[PDB]
Design a protein around this ligand. Structure first.
Ligand SMILES: Cc1cc2nc3c(=O)[nH]c(=O)nc-3n(C[C@H](O)[C@H](O)[C@H](O)COP(=O)(O)O)c2cc1C
Length: 362
């Protein structure tokens, strides 16, 4: 049973291959987008994971797209995350921070100055984000049409990722995961659907990948390549952002470039919750031969599917999302073949301890 064997993930050694996927839970304090001791307890409960990957976390105030999502840009955010990572370490866990900029998947009412959010191009996401009502409860609101970033603004985006990585290292995270998936800002540049630019950041796949590779380079230089992972969702459609008409070839180009940086891991989000066609074995093989770090697979996995693909040498670890929401001791449950707790989806987003810290261990 390879799932319960160790794995070196860049600078860290995970004791098992059962990872906690990044899960937005929208329970942070406003004003200030501040993580809380409740969040600290939730992560501490899950510290037996081979690796915890945190909820997506803003690199800056401009990055915010969801009310209740935390940041890693302010002194008060850094101080709060320091307590959270210390708690995970006291339980012998390891924790990466997933860092995002939401780009156009946002609303003006939560942006600095109440202005339109930014993106590769001035195209509405045509979906909804989560705000809070006057009682502090989560509500789904249509996205605001973004403004296209000017060329002279792109270095500031890269610097915001760099600074957020400095902050993450200071805050005690073991690794960083760049959120280059699911229709957020980096994916908005990668995708020809959302990126209609005609400068060096749009058009060719090389230009579409330019921003994410500049970010990768900047964060590797700020910390170390063996502390950097990246999440991609490069096959299919995620939150209305497709991967264009040459999605496999474009994915392999990006993966070959990422491999050159010697980063710690590639995390592939294979499907959204509504499902879609499975990755082909041939595509998995093409990814594996191009990337020489850890590959994490995610998206409706079972322990059996994970074991199959680990045993075939195609991936190294699996990230579970909803099963980690509901099972703090998922590792022990999978190892013992125990039943899993029933999930309560109504409390995934927003609220308090109920549906968050009240799922029991075995
Ligand atoms: C409530 C919820 C929140 C999520 N938040 C994030 C997130 O912040 N970042 C991310 O990359 N994926 C996020 N996802 C996707 C999950 O990381 C995971 O890839 C997905 O849940 C599919 O896997 P599963 O079948 O194991 O749940 C979220 C999923 C759910 C259900």
């Amino acid at each position: 049973e390879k799932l319960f064997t160790p794995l070196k993930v860049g600078a860290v050694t995970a004791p098992n291959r059962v990872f906690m996927a990044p899960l937005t839970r929208l329970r942070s304090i406003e004003p200030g987008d501040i993580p809380t001791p409740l969040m600290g307890e939730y992560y501490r409960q899950r510290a037996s994971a081979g690796l915890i990957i945190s909820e997506a976390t803003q690199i800056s105030a401009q990055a915010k797209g969801y009310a209740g999502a935390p940041g890693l840009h302010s002194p008060e955010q850094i101080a709060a995350w320091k307590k959270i990572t210390a708690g995970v370490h006291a339980e012998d866990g390891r924790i990466a921070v997933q860092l995002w900029h939401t780009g156009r998947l946002s609303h003006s009412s939560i942006q600095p100055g109440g202005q339109a959010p930014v993106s590769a191009s001035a195209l509405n996401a045509n979906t909804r984000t989560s705000l809070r009502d006057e009682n502090g409860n989560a509500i789904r609101v249509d996205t605001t049409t973004p403004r296209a970033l000017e060329l002279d603004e792109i270095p500031g985006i890269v610097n915001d990722f760099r600074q957020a990585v400095a902050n993450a290292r200071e805050a005690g995270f073991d690794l960083v995961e760049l959120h280059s998936a699911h229709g957020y800002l980096l994916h908005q540049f990668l995708s020809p659907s959302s990126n209609q630019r005609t400068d060096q950041y749009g058009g060719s796949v090389e230009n579409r990948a330019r921003l994410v590779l500049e970010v990768v380079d900047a964060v590797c230089n700020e910390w170390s390549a063996d502390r950097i992972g990246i999440r991609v969702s490069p096959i299919g459609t995620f939150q209305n952002v497709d991967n264009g008409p040459n999605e496999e070839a474009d994915a392999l180009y990006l993966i070959e470039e990422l491999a050159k940086r010697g980063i710690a891991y590639l995390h592939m989000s294979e499907t959204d919750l509504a499902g879609g066609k499975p990755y082909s074995e041939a595509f998995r093989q093409k990814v594996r031969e191009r990337f020489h770090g850890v590959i994490i697979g995610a998206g409706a996995y079972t322990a059996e599917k994970a074991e199959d693909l680990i045993g075939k040498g195609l991936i190294d670890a699996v990230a579970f999302g909803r099963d980690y929401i509901a099972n703090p001791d998922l590792v022990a449950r999978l190892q013992k073949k125990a039943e899993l707790n029933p999930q309560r989806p109504e409390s995934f987003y927003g609220g308090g301890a109920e549906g968050y810290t009240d799922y029991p261990s075995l």
